[PDB]
Design a protein around this motif. Structure first.
Motif, PDB file in Angstrom:
ATOM      1  N   UNK A  42       0.463  -1.520  -0.219  1.00 28.74           N
ATOM      2  CA  UNK A  42       0.071   0.082  -0.382  1.00 28.74           C
ATOM      3  C   UNK A  42       0.761   1.436  -0.221  1.00 28.74           C
ATOM      4  N   UNK A  43       1.664   1.262  -0.051  1.00 33.67           N
ATOM      5  CA  UNK A  43       2.633   2.385  -0.895  1.00 33.67           C
ATOM      6  C   UNK A  43       2.764   2.112  -1.619  1.00 33.67           C
ATOM      7  N   UNK A  44       3.827   3.491  -2.539  1.00 35.48           N
ATOM      8  CA  UNK A  44       4.800   3.869  -3.231  1.00 35.48           C
ATOM      9  C   UNK A  44       5.430   3.098  -3.817  1.00 35.48           C
TER      10      UNK A  44
ATOM     11  N   UNK B 241       5.145  -0.797  -3.502  1.00 28.71           N
ATOM     12  CA  UNK B 241       4.575  -1.959  -3.494  1.00 28.71           C
ATOM     13  C   UNK B 241       5.426  -2.533  -4.990  1.00 28.71           C
ATOM     14  N   UNK B 242       5.820  -3.528  -5.279  1.00 29.58           N
ATOM     15  CA  UNK B 242       6.270  -4.885  -5.607  1.00 29.58           C
ATOM     16  C   UNK B 242       7.486  -4.196  -6.391  1.00 29.58           C
ATOM     17  N   UNK B 243       7.962  -3.729  -5.431  1.00 30.58           N
ATOM     18  CA  UNK B 243       9.599  -3.360  -5.754  1.00 30.58           C
ATOM     19  C   UNK B 243      10.699  -4.418  -4.487  1.00 30.58           C
ATOM     20  N   UNK B 244      11.588  -4.561  -5.633  1.00 31.62           N
ATOM     21  CA  UNK B 244      12.517  -4.971  -4.705  1.00 31.62           C
ATOM     22  C   UNK B 244      13.346  -4.075  -3.771  1.00 31.62           C
TER      23      UNK B 244
ATOM     24  N   UNK C  30      11.416   5.292  -5.960  1.00 29.29           N
ATOM     25  CA  UNK C  30      10.373   5.222  -5.560  1.00 29.29           C
ATOM     26  C   UNK C  30      10.873   4.364  -3.908  1.00 29.29           C
TER      27      UNK C  30
ATOM     28  N   UNK D 170      11.156   6.860  -1.854  1.00 25.22           N
ATOM     29  CA  UNK D 170      10.212   8.423  -1.571  1.00 25.22           C
ATOM     30  C   UNK D 170       8.927   7.063  -0.566  1.00 25.22           C
TER      31      UNK D 170
ATOM     32  N   UNK E 162       8.735   8.552   3.789  1.00 24.80           N
ATOM     33  CA  UNK E 162       7.440   9.524   3.861  1.00 24.80           C
ATOM     34  C   UNK E 162       7.128   8.219   4.910  1.00 24.80           C
ATOM     35  N   UNK E 163       7.149   7.096   5.760  1.00 26.26           N
ATOM     36  CA  UNK E 163       6.996   6.578   6.211  1.00 26.26           C
ATOM     37  C   UNK E 163       7.778   6.998   7.854  1.00 26.26           C
TER      38      UNK E 163
END
Ligand code: HEM
Ligand code: HEM
Lengths: 374, 374
Positions: A74-76, A78-81, A139, A142, A146-147
């Motif tokens: 649910x963050x920017x 998601x889906x990244x290594x 990303x 970022x 943010x967190x």
């Protein structure tokens, strides 16, 4: 191919000391954030200390989760290594003042002196607390930033922040090659090698003789300088003139009298006229440990680009970051040499922000600064 | 692995039409620069036209070299792969006014209307000339942008500029997956596919009936919007509330009544209560071509992060970029629907900059806008 993909595809070493963000390969992106304790938590040294304990524990808990699993679903990101995500926490001298711990300040945390070439903006200087966040992907960076900022909202305010970049590993023709800066110069050659006893001698704080200062044992001190480059003026110089300013070649990175990047800078060498091969005002002459009674640092910097200011001049340059066990035997004497002895690079640079942070060693089941704050 | 490395290791397709920067895979980084003709070249429409011809030819010659060989030796990008570097040139309606070519302005280049939700800063709006520079690496991008701005110094001034980013291909677990934005949302699903006749129908200008406007035949129009995201407010919403605002799921990107990202948004579907499955004010309902008499665009945007403004609020969001053959049948009616019919996303976004540019087709041995300017 493997080295082009490694930084983006692997997690950082969460066990790196003092904390992640010093050793190992440096990721392509950084976000440096300086925080002050909020004005609302400064009733007394006790309310300030409780705020400091709250935010430092929160950041440490979140950093542990980020190092182990990455930014949440649910963050920017998601889906990244994992993209080598690494979080470093630092403490300013002003924090120790605010929480009533002045007697815990080591001598090495003394404020940096003014230098003759300073053009510092006060809002870009100092700070009670530091986060250095690094990753190989913007990303991932970022989302983590943010967190971490969200975790700080009730106790702190952002004083200043700067994003920086290097080339990405994926785009390197030779992934082991030294990076370049925005002036086109090879940047990092003279750093001590990480697998070398010189590295720890350079970076690690000297063991405290006062137990009140032992919280920094095994830690390091970070000097940050926001250094604007005068790139329009630099563009006017031909290549030999650029190389005379620095003391190293633009294509190979070799010293002017050498042939290879790794050839030694021979400060005693003279040309056929009897004049120095490395100019008297060349940057690498005045910055050399040999010119500074052995002062040495580990430089782990980034480029930045903040666009154009209101007067129309480009605001881009070097996010300078130097690690050392004591600024008095690292950054400070070297910067005094550059400022006072006429570094040719002074004509093309402007120091506009500055900060010093103590970066303590990580400890099992403890957060950075816990044995200082609690 | 091959798709993780392709964007960073390969050149852009320099023959992409109208110009590079629309079709193909979008690189991870963008720099959008808006320029005005310098005040010193505006004595009359003739001095302005000569300045325009000078800078457009200079940019085209440099773009050709950058596409073929990359940024020169001695730049920040020396030693790096081509990283899909691509340069796009656009022309504003105000340029045509300044050079005495008002009768060459197509109807599609009419100024964008005001919308009821606008919070536009004038210094972030408009511009005579556009460079869109893209690359998979930030140092390749920085080196190209520096060269292109240097080529413009005597004829133009930077009006505004914004750097943007997506995730890097190297960090994608699935390199073919749709990117996400800073709100964590899957971003791009409903775009027309590039190998589809719908893409050209959506993006390409309609053939001119007036030969004075034929210079835009085969070109496209770009709408840029700088849209700040209210990320602190967004952080307060739980996941179902975020999904109700958008109309698509955060984990899968599926429409609320579907199971897969590619399932159709069924605007007529009703739940057991007789109410719409896709809410009446959901973004994807009000933006859908079905809600706008078929208006459609190709969205090729980037995230941006400009830190914190003076009032302490984060300045980050979406660098929105929409391509269409005519804004009147693309961006404009859709934005009027979002603004006037109460898009739930209006509560979390603020449009703060805006520009429209005509992006003509490349032609052999000619520079963009040559048949307009000469
Ligand atoms: C924007 C400003 C600066 C630029 C562009 C710059 C650039 C460079 C370059 C290209 C090198 C040679 C390659 C290398 O060994 O890393 C170098 C060396 C070095 N620089 Fe800088 N530098 C800057 C500011 C500083 C500052 C502020 C300091 C410390 C106060 C510093 C300390 C050093 C040191 C210690 C070396 C290595 C000297 C040696 O042992 O050979 N630099 N710098
Ligand atoms: C920061 C502001 C915005 C955000 C966060 C946002 C986000 C999204 C997302 C996540 C989607 C669904 C996935 C997709 O199909 O791309 C979407 C769809 C869409 N958006 Fe936006 N959007 C924003 C502003 C705009 C604006 C200003 C316009 C046009 C004026 C627009 C036009 C569209 C269109 C046409 C669709 C596809 C609708 C369909 O055919 O299903 N969006 N947007």
């Amino acid at each position: 191919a493997e080295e082009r993909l490694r930084m983006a595809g692997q997690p950082a070493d969460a066990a790196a000391t003092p904390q992640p963000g010093i050793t190992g390969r440096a990721p392509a992106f950084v976000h440096v954030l300086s925080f002050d304790l909020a004005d609302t938590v400064r009733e007394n040294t006790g309310t300030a200390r409780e705020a400091a304990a709250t935010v430092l524990r929160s950041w440490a808990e979140l950093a542990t989760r980020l190092h182990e699993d990455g930014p949440a679903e649910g963050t920017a990101a998601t889906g990244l290594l994992p993209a080598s995500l690494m979080v470093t926490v630092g403490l300013g001298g002003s924090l120790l003042q605010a929480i009533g711990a002045a007697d815990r300040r080591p001598d090495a945390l003394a404020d940096l002196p003014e230098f003759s070439t300073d053009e510092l903006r006060p809002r870009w200087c100092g700070g009670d607390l530091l986060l250095q966040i690094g990753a190989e992907d913007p990303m991932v960076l970022a989302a983590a930033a943010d967190e971490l900022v969200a975790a700080s909202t009730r106790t702190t305010t952002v004083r200043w922040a700067l994003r920086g970049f290097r080339h990405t590993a994926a785009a390197a023709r030779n992934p082991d090659a030294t990076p370049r800066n925005l002036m086109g110069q090879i940047d990092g050659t003279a750093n001590p090698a990480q697998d070398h006893a010189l590295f720890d001698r350079t970076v690690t704080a000297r063991e405290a003789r006062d137990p009140a200062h032992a919280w920094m044992d095994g830690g390091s001190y970070l000097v940050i300088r926001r250094i604007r480059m005068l790139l329009d003026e630099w563009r006017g110089l031909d290549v030999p003139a650029r190389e005379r300013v620095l003391g190293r070649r633009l294509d190979t990175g070799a010293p002017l009298g050498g042939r290879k990047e790794t050839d030694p800078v021979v400060l005693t060498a003279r040309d056929a006229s009897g004049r120095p091969v490395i100019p008297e005002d060349a940057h690498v002459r005045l910055a050399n440990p040999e010119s500074n009674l052995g002062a040495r640092m580990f430089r782990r910097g980034y480029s930045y680009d903040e666009g154009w200011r209101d007067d129309g001049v480009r605001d881009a340059g070097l996010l300078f970051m130097a690690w050392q066990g004591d600024p008095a035997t690292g950054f400070v004497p070297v910067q005094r040499s550059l400022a006072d002895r006429g570094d040719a690079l002074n004509r093309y640079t402007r120091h506009e922000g500055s900060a010093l942070f103590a970066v303590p060693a990580a400890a099992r089941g403890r957060y950075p600064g816990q044995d200082l704050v609690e």
